[PDB]
């Protein structure tokens, strides 16, 4: 379903460690993994 | 015994459908206490919900 | 006997004490010994070279579609060839590169033999999307290379590099006769295989004096190409080998002066789009033809336009700086300030130039021998 995809993505992508890290970003390469550099 | 055990559970595991129990609170009639307080008592688990109605 | 079956080494016996605290002196000696880890030469190999007319032959058969090297052999080969061309032109100022692509038992001369790197890189990028079909023909590619290089001057070293992916080659005639002709023409042939060893390539490399290698992986391929980058050793003196070349100064035009004359670039004139009609660039010293890129041989008068700094960058090899005489600080009865950095001399060893008898510290000595390549005192 169209809404099911959005709901599942919202739940999974931002469950525990995003409702606070994103807030900090809003209020504010060698060690990065290859998938984090693309 | 092994070859009947490996297949007797196939139909057994496909009978149950719902595992989690529904816990909807079905409150009954409200009771009026002092200071316009209204209390609802759940008929399934005895949950008490007291509220002040404007 | 065995080295490790004797007595166990005690490396910590070096440090000793006489006044209870000389470990500071020992670690100072260790720190001084840590420096000077080089031989005062960035390369330390071949200090000279010679004009190379190198021809690169690339296989274009169906075997290039194999996925041994991701994504396929053709793409990795062309990327490493672009890198090789860049490095080769960096390490060889007046060299020329030709590219030949062999396909369907015939050889196509993809690029003319010249010294422009940009043209070769553009040709390789265009050839990235080629069609891999048929079988390679070593005979035709070698015949084209020999026909082109037969009229080249003798003093230049004539070299052919072959990238042979397919294990089978179709020859319209006997190939060993062509190998004998190449040997008589003093043309060096080097082959870099991709799948496995082929007898004809080994015979060709052995007879023509080249080297034949087989790729293990992409890193080994790059290592082999980098080895091929290095120029060969050059004989003492053969003949009057010289060449008429110009040094076009980069005279741009400014409208503040009345001599601001726009001109079309000859290199850009052959493009489909509008050629760059810039205010100025590199004007030929002989016929005043305008070019944008260097080093590019002049199309009109045939003069070779080279950049003087590129030729001068290798002059330090001809005149290396002799190592300074290491002298202990106590034995030097002179000034105690370094001539290069004006710093106070407190190291146990002081280096004195043999020519001007000046004073240099360890850091300044390392900098002079490694990077500066000239003694500041001798300049004065």
């Amino acid at each position: 379903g169209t809404s099911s995809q959005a709901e599942a993505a919202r739940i999974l992508a931002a469950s525990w460690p995003q409702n606070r890290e994103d807030e900090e970003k809003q209020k504010l390469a060698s060690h990065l993994f290859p998938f984090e550099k693309l | 015994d092994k070859k009947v055990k490996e297949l007797r559970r196939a139909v057994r595991s496909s009978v149950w459908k719902r595992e989690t129990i529904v816990h909807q609170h079905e409150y009954g009639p409200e009771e009026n206490l002092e200071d316009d307080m209204y209390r609802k008592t759940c008929t399934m688990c005895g949950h008490e919900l007291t509220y002040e109605k404007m | 006997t065995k080295r490790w079956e004797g007595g166990y080494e005690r490396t910590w016996e070096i440090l000793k004490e006489d006044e209870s605290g000389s470990l500071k002196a020992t670690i100072e000696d260790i720190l001084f010994k840590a420096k000077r880890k080089r031989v005062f030469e960035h390369h330390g190999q071949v200090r000279l070279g010679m004009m190379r007319h190198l021809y690169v032959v690339v296989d274009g058969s169906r075997t290039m579609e194999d996925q041994d090297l991701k994504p396929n052999r053709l793409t990795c080969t062309l990327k490493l060839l672009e890198y090789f061309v860049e490095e080769y032109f960096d390490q060889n100022p007046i060299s020329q590169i030709g590219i030949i692509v062999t396909k369907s038992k015939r050889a196509e001369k993809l690029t003319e033999l010249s010294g422009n790197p940009r043209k070769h890189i553009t040709s390789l990028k265009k050839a990235v999307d080629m069609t891999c079909h048929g079988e390679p023909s070593l005979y035709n590619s070698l015949s084209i290379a020999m026909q082109t290089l037969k009229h080249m001057p003798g003093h230049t070293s004539r070299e052919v590099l072959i990238i042979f992916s397919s294990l089978t080659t179709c020859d319209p005639s006997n190939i060993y006769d062509l190998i004998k002709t190449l040997k008589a023409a003093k043309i060096r042939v080097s082959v870099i295989g991709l799948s496995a060893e082929v007898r004809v390539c080994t015979v060709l490399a052995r007879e023509t004096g080249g080297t034949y290698h087989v790729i293990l992986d992409e890193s080994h391929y790059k290592e082999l190409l980098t080895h091929h980058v290095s120029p060969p050793p050059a004989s003492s003196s053969s003949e009057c080998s010289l060449i008429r070349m110009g040094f076009p100064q980069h005279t741009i035009a400014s409208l503040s002066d009345q001599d601001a004359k726009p001109s079309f670039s000859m290199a850009h004139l052959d493009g489909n789009t509008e050629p760059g009609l810039t205010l100025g660039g590199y004007f030929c010293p002989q016929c005043r033809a305008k070019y944008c890129e260097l080093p590019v041989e002049c199309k009109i008068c045939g003069l070779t336009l080279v950049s003087a700094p590129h030729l001068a960058r290798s002059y330090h090899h001809l005149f290396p700086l002799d190592a300074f005489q290491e002298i202990p600080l106590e034995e030097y009865n002179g000034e105690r300030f370094c001539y290069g950095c004006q710093g106070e001399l407190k190291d146990q060893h002081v280096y004195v130039c043999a020519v001007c008898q000046n004073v240099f510290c360890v850091d300044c000595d390392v900098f002079v021998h490694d990077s500066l390549h000239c003694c500041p005192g001798c300049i004065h």
């Binding site: - | - | 089978t168 496995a196 007898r199 004809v200 390539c201």
Partner: protein
């Protein structure tokens, strides 16, 4: 290899039972046994399956995509002349022998001594250069033991 059958094939009293395996800086041979093909069907040359089309196609495919990896010389031994000719006939009938031809030259060893000698000579001259060649013969033939395939040959 079997030192227990020779003493009983012929009246003999061995006292050695000794074998030696060469050692080098690297393994100079790569023996391997290929069973089922890409279709997961056995390529066994069983008598009941000699006329099978699937096994003949598998043999042709093996000889084709093998001829593209090993350079300058392949020697293939068949069980018999009849099986060899029947297999090459089926290869010719399909569009598979052409793909083998465009990789390496095909040379067929026959009973004629002069024809066998000239085929061996042209096989050697094709292996000398980069064209490559295939030598198809029989295990129980005069060419199996009459020549030795030294390095770069076969």
């Amino acid at each position: 290899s079997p030192l227990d059958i020779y003493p009983k094939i012929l009246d003999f009293h061995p006292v050695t039972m000794a074998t030696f395996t060469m050692t080098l800086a690297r393994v100079c041979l790569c023996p391997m046994i290929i069973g089922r093909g890409n279709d997961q069907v056995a390529i066994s040359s069983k008598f009941e399956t000699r006329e099978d089309i699937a096994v003949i196609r598998n043999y042709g495919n093996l000889l084709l995509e093998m001829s593209a990896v090993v350079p300058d010389g392949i020697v293939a031994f068949f069980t018999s002349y009849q099986y060899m000719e029947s297999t090459v006939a089926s290869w010719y009938e399909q569009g598979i022998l052409e793909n083998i031809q465009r990789n390496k030259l095909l040379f067929i060893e026959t009973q004629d001594g002069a024809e066998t000698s000239v085929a061996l000579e042209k096989y050697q001259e094709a292996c000398e250069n980069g064209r490559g060649a295939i030598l198809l013969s029989v295990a129980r033939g005069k060419v199996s033991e009459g020549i030795d395939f030294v390095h770069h040959y076969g």
